[PDB]
Amino acid sequence: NFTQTLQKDANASSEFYINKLGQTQELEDQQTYKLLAARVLIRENKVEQSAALLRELGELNDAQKLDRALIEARISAAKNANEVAQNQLRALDLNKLSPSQKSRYYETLAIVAENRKDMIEAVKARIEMDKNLTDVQRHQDNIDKTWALLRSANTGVINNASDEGNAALGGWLTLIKAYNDYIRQPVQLSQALQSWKNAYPNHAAATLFPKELLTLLNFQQTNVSQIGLLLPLSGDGQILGTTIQSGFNDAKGNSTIPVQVFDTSMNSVQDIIAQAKQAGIKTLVGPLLKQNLDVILADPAQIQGMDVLALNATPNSRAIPQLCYYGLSPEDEAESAANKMWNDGVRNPLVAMPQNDLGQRVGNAFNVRWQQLAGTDANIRYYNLPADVTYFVQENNTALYAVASPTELAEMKGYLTNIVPNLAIYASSRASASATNTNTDFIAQMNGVQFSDIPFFKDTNSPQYQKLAKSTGGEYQLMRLYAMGADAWLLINQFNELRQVPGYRLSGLTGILSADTNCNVERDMTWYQYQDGAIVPVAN
Numbered sequence: 001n002f003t004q005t006l007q008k009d010a011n012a013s014s015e016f017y018i019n020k021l022g023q024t025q026e027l028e029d030q031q032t033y034k035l036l037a038a039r040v041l042i043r044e045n046k047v048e049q050s051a052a053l054l055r056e057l058g059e060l061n062d063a064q065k066l067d068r069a070l071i072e073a074r075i076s077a078a079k080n081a082n083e084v085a086q087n088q089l090r091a092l093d094l095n096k097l098s099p100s101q102k103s104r105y106y107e108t109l110a111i112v113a114e115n116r117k118d119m120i121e122a123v124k125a126r127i128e129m130d131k132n133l134t135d136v137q138r139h140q141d142n143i144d145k146t147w148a149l150l151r152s153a154n155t156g157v158i159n160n161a162s163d164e165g166n167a168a169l170g171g172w173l174t175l176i177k178a179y180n181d182y183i184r185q186p187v188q189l190s191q192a193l194q195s196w197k198n199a200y201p202n203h204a205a206a207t208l209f210p211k212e213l214l215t216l217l218n219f220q221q222t223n224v225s226q227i228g229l230l231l232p233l234s235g236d237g238q239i240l241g242t243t244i245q246s247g248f249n250d251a252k253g254n255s256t257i258p259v260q261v262f263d264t265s266m267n268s269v270q271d272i273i274a275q276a277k278q279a280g281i282k283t284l285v286g287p288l289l290k291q292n293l294d295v296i297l298a299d300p301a302q303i304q305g306m307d308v309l310a311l312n313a314t315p316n317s318r319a320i321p322q323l324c325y326y327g328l329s330p331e332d333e334a335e336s337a338a339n340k341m342w343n344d345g346v347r348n349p350l351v352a353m354p355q356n357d358l359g360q361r362v363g364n365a366f367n368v369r370w371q372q373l374a375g376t377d378a379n380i381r382y383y384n385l386p387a388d389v390t391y392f393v394q395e396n397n398t399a400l401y402a403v404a405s406p407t408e409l410a411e412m413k414g415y416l417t418n419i420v421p422n423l424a425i426y427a428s429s430r431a432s433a434s435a436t437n438t439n440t441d442f443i444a445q446m447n448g449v450q451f452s453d454i455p456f457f458k459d460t461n462s463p464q465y466q467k468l469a470k471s472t473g474g475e476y477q478l479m480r481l482y483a484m485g486a487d488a489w490l491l492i493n494q495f496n497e498l499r500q501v502p503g504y505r506l507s508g509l510t511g512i513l514s515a516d517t518n519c520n521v522e523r524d525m526t527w528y529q530y531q532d533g534a535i536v537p538v539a540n
Contacts, residue, residue: 002029005036006067007098009135014040014049031057031064038071039104047078066096070104077111085112099132106132110149119153120161127168130204140208147210150176171200179213186501190219215500222307222496226258228276230286231311232265241265241288243478244311247485247509248285264288269295273302283495284308285488296323307495309488313520315361324498324519326491328484328510330358330403331365333428333452336525337401338369338378340452340539341426344399347374352389352402352412355382362403362428386411390419399424406436410445427451432528434474443533450529450538456483456509458526458537483509491521512540 010017017037024030034057041050054071057064069088076085085108097105110125126146133139150158150172158177163170175196182189193216197206209217229248231241245261252259260281262272269292276284284303287293288311296303297316303323312327341349351366353359363380370378381392386408389400397420402409409431416423431451436442456479459465472478487508497504498515506513512524527539 003032003061003063005032006063007101009100009138010036010039012036012040014044014046027058028061028064031060035064035067035071039067042071042074042078047075051075066092067101070101070108074104074108074111077108077115080115082112082115099134102132103129103138110145114149119149120157122149123153123172124166124169127166127172130168136208139204140211143205143208143210144212146172147176147205147212151179151212155180167200168203171196171203171205174199175205175213183501183503186216186219186497186504187221189216193217212502219500220496222493224257224283224493224495226260226279226281226283227492228272228279228281228284229259229261230264230269230272230284230292231261231288233261233263235265237265237288239478240481243472243481244288244485244488247482247487248489249485250482251486251489262286264292270299270302273306276306282306283492285492286311288312290314293317293325307492309492309495311484311488317518317520319518322499324491324495324515324521326484326488326513326521328480329523330362330428330430332523333525334362334366334401334403335369336452336523336527337426337428338366338373340450340525340527341399341401342370342373344424346399346424348376349378349399349401350389350392351378351380352392352400352404353380353382354403355384359403366401387415390415393419393423399426401426403428403430406431406433406442409449410436410442413446413449425449429453429476429480429525432457432476434476437535440533443530443535446530447532448530450527452525452527454480454483454510455526455537455540456480457528480510487513 014037017033017040020033021030024033034053038050038053041053050071054068057068060068069092073085073088076088089105089108092105094102094105106125106129110122110129113119113122113125123146126142126149130139130142133142153176158173158180161173163173178189178192178196182192193213200206229245231244232238233241233245260276260279262276264272264287269287273296282305284306290312293310293312294314294316296308296310297314297318297320300320300323307322308324310323310325313325313329313331317325351363353363359382363382367378367380370376379392383389386404389402389412393416400423402412402425404412404427409427413425425448427449429452432453456465460469468479468482472482487510490506490508491498491513494506498521499519504514510523511526514522514524516522524540526537528535529538
């Protein structure tokens with residue numbers, strides 16, 4: 001009678017079923033607890049202990065022999081023994097299984113199909129799984145997994161895919177087809193989803209909508225009525241806030257949206273926020289300085305009832321409702337460098353950061369991203385003199401990423417030409433200045449070096465570019481601040497899209513803009529390379 005426990009869901013921990021052995025007297029009942037533990041051990045990502053415990057099993061009755069083979073095949077699928085896993089499940093009598101056992105049976109199939117990148121068959125497997133589930137939370141997990149398979153499936157296979165008279169598969173295919181067809185237009189996709197829940201009302205997902213789509217069902221376009229602009233426009237950083245203001249205004253154009261300017265150099269940020277609340281302003285851009293942003297982070301409740309696009313990021317930056325961080329951050333240029341370098345074939349690179357507070361953060365943003373692509377920690381080394389790079393290379397003889405001045409970067413390579421002259425050098429936008437990109441003696445010495453910078457510098461002939469280069473006096477920093485202000489107008493009008501729409505992307509003057517889980521605005525950088533006396537865009 002206790003063997004029948006196998007036919008049900010196993011909701012306890014592995015330690016629970018294993019510890020019951022000391023109290024379990026009968027031999028069959030000891031084996032049952034062993035199988036229940038092995039079943040849960042897989043759900044705990046402990047495959048070896050599951051296979052190991054299976055090796056402790058002795059003599060089993062037929063009901064146990066059956067449950068073991070389920071756990072055997074699931075292990076095989078975990079270890080990518082796809083042909084083995086399937087043959088192990090072809091040997092079972094699918095009629096002898098309970099609903100819970102059929103659920104585990106078809107989940108293993110879905111993993112084999114997913115292992116083989118065969119997404120449609122993996123979805124078909126999870127539909128049969130859903131028919132045998134009883135726990136609501138397990139239902140939701142199957143639906144969340146099912147949605148993830150469709151979202152990774154090739155877009156062509158989905159458009160031409162037939163539902164094969166299968167209503168379940170029909171509703172799934174139509175749902176993903178709407179997602180891919182209108183994800184760039186969320187307002188339109190919201191109408192499609194609401195239509196979907198009336199088209200397939202008895203669909204399992206009509207009741208338990210996948211998590212990724214709940215924010216999209218009743219999505220609402222940003223309706224900016226009033227903006228408050230927090231920038232330093234007097235005293236210190238005046239040029240920063242004024243040039244940023246120039247970009248914001250020029251990108252705003254003939255918009256009726258009233259903007260109220262708040263000068264942080266002459267007013268407290270907590271007083272500004274209070275006055276904004278008083279004037280009925282529900283949308284802010286800024287502040288710019290890290291310290292002033294931390295005033296918000298020192299008490300997030302201040303911005304209760306507002307959408308705020310802060311223009312910087314701090315170590316205290318974190319997930320805060322209706323708060324998103326958008327700064328010309330070196331962490332982004334390092335995260336982009338980790339990507340560029342990886343896609344180019346670089347493995348285990350040397351990273352040269354300055355031994356200051358800014359260098360540690362950027363190195364951490366670099367490595368964390370590198371842990372994603374490489375699964376390893378990179379060589380982050382901190383330099384006090386550009387000449388210290390020599391010993392870093394003298395350790396072993398490859399690609400370098402360095403954050404340094406345009407001249408500091410020229411010293412580094414010169415020190416390395418005798419040591420390793422054919423080294424692939426990557427740098428951040430800090431290595432790009434007007435005084436140096438106009439002189440071929442610098443452009444020639446830097447042949448092969450590539451750096452990240454905003455895509456605005458691709459077109460140095462456009463009238464748009466013309467007017468700005470002469471207006472800023474030829475200083476790239478003032479030109480990037482102008483680009484940020486402009487992209488802030490793009491971003492603050494796409495604010496709700498940014499928080500609610502997965503993978504949302506925007507082509508702005510500062511790069512391809514998107515958001516992470518902490519609504520930190522990421523930037524996909526443009527990469528430029530010095531080639532035979534010219535600077536050409538290599539990527540993006």
